[PDB]
Amino acid sequence: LYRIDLFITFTDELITFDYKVHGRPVLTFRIPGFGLTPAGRMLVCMGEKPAHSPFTSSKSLYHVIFTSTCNSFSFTIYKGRYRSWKKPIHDELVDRGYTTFREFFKAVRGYHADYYKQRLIHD
């Protein structure tokens, strides 16, 4: 049983992706921000490419949880942080599995591959 937590922070200026293993930082990247609806933010969390909206001047956080066994792969998105009491805004379970962390991690990063290409780095 492998698990990765990804926290996505949306502002109009930047969208930040923070990946964690055992809750500690392993990978981060950020891209230029754009205007989004609530629906649009969920689609970004999903790794889709939504239509842009007017700016909102808002800051919001979304919590994406990836887990896998040799039998199944789970993908869950929360508005804000996971809580015992909170319903996910999107939840997917698929009959694919992984038996090494490196391959699991490669699958996880595949969700946002196209956003990774847009990342901003130092020179």
Residue ranges binding RNA (CB under 7 A): 3, 5, 7, 18, 20, 22-25, 63, 80-85
Choose between 21 and 50: whose C-beta lies nearer to RNA: 21
Tokens of 32: 């230029």
Choose between 3 and 90: whose C-beta lies nearer to RNA: 3
Choose between 12 and 18: whose C-beta lies nearer to RNA: 18
Choose between 7 and 34: whose C-beta lies nearer to RNA: 7
Cα–Cα nearest to 48, from 18, 84, 83, 92: 92
**Through-space distance between the first and last CA atoms of the chain, rounded to whole angstroms:** 38
18-55 as b/e: b if 16+ CB within 10 A: bbeeeeeeeeebbbeebebeeebbbebbbeeeeeeeee
Cβ at position 49, least distance to RNA in Å: 26
